[PDB]
Amino acid sequence: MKNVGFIGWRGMVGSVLMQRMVEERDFDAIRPVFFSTSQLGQAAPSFGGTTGTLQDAFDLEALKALDIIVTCQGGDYTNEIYPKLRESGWQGYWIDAASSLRMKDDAIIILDPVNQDVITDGLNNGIRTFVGGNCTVSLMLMSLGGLFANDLVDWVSVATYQAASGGGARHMRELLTQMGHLYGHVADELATPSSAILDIERKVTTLTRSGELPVDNFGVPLAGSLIPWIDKQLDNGQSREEWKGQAETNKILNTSSVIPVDGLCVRVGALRCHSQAFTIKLKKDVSIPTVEELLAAHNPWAKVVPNDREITMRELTPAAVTGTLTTPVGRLRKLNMGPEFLSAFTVGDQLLWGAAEPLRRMLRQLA
Amino acid sequence: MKNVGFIGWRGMVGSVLMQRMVEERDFDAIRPVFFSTSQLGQAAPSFGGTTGTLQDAFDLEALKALDIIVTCQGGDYTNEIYPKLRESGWQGYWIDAASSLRMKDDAIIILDPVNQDVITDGLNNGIRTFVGGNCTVSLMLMSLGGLFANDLVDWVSVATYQAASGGGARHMRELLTQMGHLYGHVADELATPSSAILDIERKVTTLTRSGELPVDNFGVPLAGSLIPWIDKQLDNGQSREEWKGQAETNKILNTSSVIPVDGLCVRVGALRCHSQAFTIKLKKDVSIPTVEELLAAHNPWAKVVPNDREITMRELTPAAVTGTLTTPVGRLRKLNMGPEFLSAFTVGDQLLWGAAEPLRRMLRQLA
Ligand SMILES: NC(=O)C1=CN([C@@H]2O[C@H](COP(=O)(O)OP(=O)(O)OC[C@H]3O[C@@H](n4cnc5c(N)ncnc54)[C@H](OP(=O)(O)O)[C@@H]3O)[C@@H](O)[C@H]2O)C=CC1
Ligand SMILES: NC(=O)C1=CN([C@@H]2O[C@H](COP(=O)(O)OP(=O)(O)OC[C@H]3O[C@@H](n4cnc5c(N)ncnc54)[C@H](OP(=O)(O)O)[C@@H]3O)[C@@H](O)[C@H]2O)C=CC1
């Protein structure tokens, strides 16, 4: 029985991760310890049928006692404790969800179904830090894994439809709240099916334009609009969120040569799943049936959806994926630009495969 | 004082078109009329000093009396009355917003700022039908007009973030309603900002997945998700909404050679504005400053937004455009694939430039 510490288990990711471990009875093989950063000393989760109290997430000594650490707290926490802990001589395993140590030397980005070999290699090479990549990239590779795995990709152009859950709980709750505010302001006009549309329109356009909407976690309203910028601003024209695309994809895949990945990461009113619209350029003119066969033959979760108007609406949508381990790919076909241009549209819960699952699976490897 | 008849002025478009005509004092140079297909007999608009009662938009004899007809009703009406009317020998002008006659020989797709010449030529050639193009395309050309106007485009790849207002009033009201249902179900949990996020999450995911959400106008929930298919299914892998991209763009621009336009049209929780993420391939390596200078030098509404994280959030969003005649373009820069790949992201009210305005401006031309 290994002493596994859990930090940031209360957050959006931690919660999904906890819920998942119970399902697969993940707590049966380990010795759970629950840390906190604001409720230190309080009653502990007891997920693994364990009775205790919340440990000091910042107690170095307390942290050095565990064989493994699983954090879903955030990058701010990592950058604060990790360097200080490794310095203390801690030679345990650090499984993280935050981006912090992703592009670091002593860390390996994990996506079992996509790069187990890399994982294993680094494992036999001394790597003790395993980090999950960006939920979107992690999702992209899970859905379009077959293509890369066959060296069929020349470069990729993405346009993401990212859900509010990506920013965390406060962000989701904010969207939902903003949602309510919007509706309420016109609940009566909506009650009267004939009432002029402009009346309802003006009313909602005004609310939004009025600082009345809670935008503390988004800076701007998202309920009835979108935001073309996710992460910080980089020294280039790229936004950190977009830049993660190319960097991490090559790291995860351990490519011999950079596979150009770029596009636009946009935040939308999507509640829980992350969807992406691709414009991939193939090295050779591969037939779509071959492509589909490949994508499906890469991993049990990569599910190809037919280019059907009905099916697409019923399956290639957050509402039909949110909560599932499936990572659908649809709207697959060649673009008018030529047969080397493949058009695809994926969707997937970024809290599972894009977050919790990779870690959960990795933890079981070291348990 | 021409006899201009107005049909379908009640809907999401007619309303906008009407509200605009008042603002610009458009009614002053014309003797209006107001028909209807669902409230014949009731009260008339009372816009341009002409109050009375809705007339029969199905009375051919009555229609033949007008010098011009402006419909915002819909394709079903057009397909029904237009052929029958032109047969009766009606030689008047027909300004439409409906797709029906767009790709027809006797019609011209209007976008004054983008193709005045074509409009004019067609006017001098005998064309009496002027139709506005798909909101999306119409918006793209208004925003990216400078590029095409300079033969700098090789082909375009779009991924649209289309608003609920595109489907009409019932569609918007539905989204808004769906919105309220979502929030309400978790109004209490949201009231307690410290409560567990999964509880709230589970609660909203259940509602959606349950047929309790009003999805009459969309077939599936949109409030907290999206739909990767807009129009009907074409005999190819393209969805009618996407297919409109290439066809109309070349018609409007009156291109000598087809400019490949393709991508994915998705419907989102956006309330009123249509945003688009492009991946355009230039014929030559044009510097971004040149591009920006061009885009801005094409038309007074094409506004280039700097690649600033702050500015972008504050301006390149539906909330900051909805209700304005401006068609912003931001996130402009070269993609990693090479200097010939320009990345752009536009936003614009599809009910103004995407709908009413083109007609409004055209009518005045014929007044
Ligand atoms: N959100 C997503 O979809 C994904 C996020 N990530 C990454 O994972 C890390 C954590 O992400 P995420 O789960 O979104 O973070 P959250 O902000 O939702 O959770 C992190 C911490 O926030 C605190 N918190 C404060 N208020 C609440 C509240 N009302 N409900 C729940 N928790 C609250 C908790 O601190 P305390 O210790 O006191 O309990 C918790 O551990 C980040 O580095 C992020 O970038 C990676 C993939 C996906
Ligand atoms: N929506 C958009 O942003 C754009 C739409 N178009 C095109 O314009 C055409 C019409 O679309 P649009 O105006 O959006 O459609 P709407 O359904 O919003 O309005 C058009 C007609 O719908 C009827 N209607 C039924 N119920 C309502 C209601 N509750 N509130 C208001 N009107 C109602 C009205 O008929 P009646 O008067 O008889 O009651 C009205 O004339 C289409 O062919 C479309 O493709 C083009 C560009 C943009």
UniProtKB/Swiss-Prot annotation, chains A, B:
PROSITE patterns from the UniProt entry: ASD (PS01103)
Keyword vocabulary terms for this entry: Amino-acid biosynthesis, Diaminopimelate biosynthesis, Lysine biosynthesis, Methionine biosynthesis, NADP, Oxidoreductase, Threonine biosynthesis
Ligand binding (phosphate): 102, 244
Binding positions for substrate per the UniProt entry: 162, 241, 267
Pathway assigned to this chain's UniProt record: Amino-acid biosynthesis; L-lysine biosynthesis via DAP pathway; (S)-tetrahydrodipicolinate from L-aspartate: step 2/4; Amino-acid biosynthesis; L-methionine biosynthesis via de novo pathway; L-homoserine from L-aspartate: step 2/3; Amino-acid biosynthesis; L-threonine biosynthesis; L-threonine from L-aspartate: step 2/5
Class of the enzyme per the UniProt entry, highest EC level: oxidoreductase
GO annotations of cellular component type: cytosol
Entry note about domains: Consists of two domains, an N-terminal nucleotide-binding domain and a C-terminal dimerization domain.
Subunit structure: Homodimer.
Protein name as catalogued: Aspartate-semialdehyde dehydrogenase
Source species of the chain: Escherichia coli (strain K12)
Gene transcribed to yield this protein: asd
